[PDB]
């Protein structure tokens, strides 16, 4: 297919943007790329961070928190890198016990009021990044743990505020996870490298969203090295050499109604403004040379 | 129930063997009440050579008893196993035998899953194993289906045995009940004895169908147990 | 159980209300009884004002009765919670807080977990791997002894409630049997009437105290449901 | 600790050697490695692989089938690369329901009649090879489902159930043999990357929650820096192997023994080519770091 992003600018309906995959693959460059990508086009795009690296702030050297801002150097460059564990600060007795109850509670409750600050203002669209996918793939479950929740507080201060609490967080979550299966503004990327493992839990990931019906079209790889004219490492040729072999299979499979984009290593960790706008270019124009 | 958690118990508190031995007398009297209702219903069965047709009925009872002793609840439904193995116009013996025909690509599936690479196959591996969990899915879904049917099956055919079962444990009792089917010897029995009899509206000295209905149970009963001197 | 199913397959076959009438003519006996038990709880209960000890007995039974009606045999449990969250001597419950404040250190090593991140603390990251599952493990282990002592603790009272219900419900016509309760006004029942007190030794023309045994928990019953009309 | 294997070379009673892991790594190189240097001091030592990849065409240019043979150049490498399928093979009503209540059926035959034969002789050690980890490790589960077979059941009937009796009392014993700890061993490998040395650690207390320890970690294609000679790929992926090689430096330096074993040009194929590669792992190779 057309090896960029291209038709994911052109839906102006588009609203929702996941991205994600495993470790050690920098989806933070990924990120900040689409982010800016998206801002040449668009009108009002904010990012969302949950990961405890607290990587935008090594991205732009600026300190953030738990309130949006405009950083420097841009008109709509926005985001607030935030923490799941200040829920749990805001519970620091029964709460825990009833935490006790089922494995996860609170955590979706800060989801939730997160994404009442994001319907809050009037923001065009946003993204997210998340952590490894077992900690991750729960929020999709979150409104069967809400379902949980309420059939057990219905058998077990007053308790009818709490009731109604619960029951504004039931509505909020079934909008969101209506929202979801709309998939006219909402869309899911994935990313991976070039060896075996990374390649493994892809496709268990979508076979996971293929078992929750939300598809996709965009899969980004990473640090695919092309050789230099002339100059050689006699271990970067076999690197490359076993890198092909990998890549021909996703080729063998994505290549019918997904795109693959070509994303080499760049010889230093991409920081500042420019750089990143240099690194951003190549999601439109693939850069490919003779091979 | 222990007698031992009763014991634990009897400590705390600080005549008992009398009834004790006083209960167990009762026992005796229906022992050789059933023993003088043995000798009865074989000078019952003694009469029949020499000389109707409702001890034909009870002989027809005895196997129905025998087969409620000697019942499967689950064995009954083995032999509707067999039963629905027959007819070719079921409707859910074909859905059967498609159940058996995917098995045969499931299995031949996963040969050919096992059989293939990790390394070189990768898509074919994607492919195989998006068909694994395709039909995996669909497996059980027959499990819920037939398997459902088959417990209605049974909750059908166990009310269907026992209508045959109960309306001879009291059609008997409610036709030819007064109609006598035996006279007693005159003089062998109490008056009060003889009351049963009363009761049902069956004249005075003659017996009911009551004893023959129960416990003649018991009468092939014991040769039930002779049959477990035979195997055993 | 429908009558419809039933009347689907009463198709396959091609008297009935003869036994559909005759069965239903048998329920005007047994409510005619509890009538007369009515009447003679009320004759009963004028008697006490006029003129001991053994009806208070009957009265608590009565208290009894109705805790074996409004039983929760759970909730006698739930009794036995506040019971056990009282002594500050119960061995069990001095591990039922340390439980609980291992609950305590593993919902705050798990947001010491979560608050963690995967990249630069991954030594730190599976020592507080190890230390949740190693956490997990004995945490279910109380859940297998404790709940397991209080079900046997259930098991001991059940019976230890069951002695005091059933050893008035035995010892009552154990003693004081054949010395009479109090006397029927002569002639007003007839002498197969008298039979009851006959059976148990008490002289010809007193009662007994079986009616007083079981049938007065009807008596209350309908003030517990008077109950239910306060309530609901 | 000790970068060697020198604890596997002196003991002389063990039996058993459990090597897998995941792929991409080269691991039936690293168990060719292992078993060239078993042999050398050694007496009757047999390899079983059940792959689907028959690498051991790869690594001597010779079919292996269903027999054991020995290779030229040596006196002890034995090898048979069979797959468990020939069990599904002798598959082909009964027993073919059987296939329903439990999953796996012809695994367990297998390891049966391979550890028959494999007991039927009297070699001195074996050396073995596995699928990816939860398709590994589901063989734990064949007392299990043995048991649950016994179960089921408890004269074309009652042979089959003395049987699998013999098959119950002899998975005992091998189970029975298992445990001991002085002839059964496990060495897990791993490389460079995230995933990694995440799905090892996933591993490791899978045999802590059975009851089996380890005290041996491979690593694999360690790439050293050349002096003079610089590519600029090199340096930031020497930085990278680094940072997850001194995180690892921090785990298991106490209890376990880290091998390093650098990439080389090729997949080293043929004996000779094959036994300076073997070399590294008793002396190994350390530059100035
Ligand atoms: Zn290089």
Request: proline share 4%.
């Amino acid at each position: 297919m057309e090896p960029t992003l291209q038709s994911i600018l052109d839906q102006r309906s588009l609203r929702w943007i996941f991205v994600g995959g495993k470790g050690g693959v920098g989806k933070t460059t990924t990120s900040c790329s689409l982010a800016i990508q998206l801002a040449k086009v668009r009108r009002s795009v904010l990012l969302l961070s949950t990961d405890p690296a607290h990587n935008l702030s090594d991205a732009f050297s600026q300190k953030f928190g738990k309130e949006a801002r405009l950083v420097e150097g841009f008109d709509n460059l926005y985001a607030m890198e935030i923490d799941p564990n200040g829920s749990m600060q805001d519970l620091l007795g029964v709460m825990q016990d009833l935490a006790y109850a089922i494995p996860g509670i609170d955590e979706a409750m800060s989801f939730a009021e997160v994404l009442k600050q994001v319907n809050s203002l009037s923001y065009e669209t946003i993204v997210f990044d998340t952590a490894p996918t077992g900690h991750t793939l729960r929020f999709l479950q979150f409104p069967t743990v809400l379902e949980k929740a309420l059939a057990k507080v219905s058998q077990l201060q007053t308790l009818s505020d709490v009731m109604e609490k619960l029951d504004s967080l039931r509505v909020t979550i079934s909008e969101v996870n209506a929202q979801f299966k709309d998939e006219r503004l909402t869309t899911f990327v994935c990313v991976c490298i070039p060896e075996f493992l990374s390649l493994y839990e892809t496709e268990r990931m979508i076979q996971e969203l293929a078992n929750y019906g939300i598809d996709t079209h965009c899969i980004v790889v990473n640090q695919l090295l092309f050789p230099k004219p002339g100059s050689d490492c006699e271990q970067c040729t076999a690197r490359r050499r076993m890198q092909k072999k990998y890549l021909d299979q996703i080729e063998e499979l994505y290549d019918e109604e997904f795109n693959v984009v070509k994303m080499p290593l760049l010889v230093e960790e991409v920081r500042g403004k420019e750089r990143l706008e240099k690194f951003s270019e190549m999601l439109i124009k693939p850069f490919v040379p003779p091979e | 129930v222990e007698q031992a958690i009763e014991l634990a118990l009897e400590f705390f508190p600080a005549l008992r063997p009398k009834v004790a031995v006083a209960m167990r007398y009762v026992d005796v009297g229906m022992t050789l009440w059933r023993d003088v209702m043995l000798a009865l219903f074989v000078l019952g069965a003694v009469a029949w050579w020499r000389a109707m047709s409702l001890l034909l009925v009870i002989f027809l009872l005895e196997l129905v008893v025998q087969l409620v002793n000697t019942i499967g609840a689950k064995t009954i439904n083995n032999l509707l196993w067999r039963f629905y193995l027959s007819i070719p116009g079921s409707p859910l013996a074909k859905d059967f035998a498609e159940q058996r025909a995917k098995q045969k690509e499931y299995l031949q599936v996963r040969h050919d899953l096992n059989a293939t690479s990790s390394q070189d196959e990768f898509a074919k591996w994607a492919r195989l194993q998006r068909k694994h969990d395709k039909l995996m899915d669909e497996l059980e879904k027959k499990k819920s289906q037939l398997d459902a049917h088959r417990t209605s099956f049974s909750r059908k055919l166990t009310i269907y045995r026992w209508i045959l079962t109960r309306g001879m444990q009291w059609f008997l009792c409610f036709w030819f009940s007064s109609q006598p089917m035996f006279w007693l010897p005159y003089g062998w029995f109490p008056y009060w004895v003889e009351w049963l009899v009363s009761f049902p509206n069956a004249p005075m000295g003659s017996v009911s169908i009551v004893v023959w209905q129960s416990a003649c149970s018991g009468v092939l009963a014991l040769v039930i147990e002779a049959v477990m001197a035979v195997v055993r």
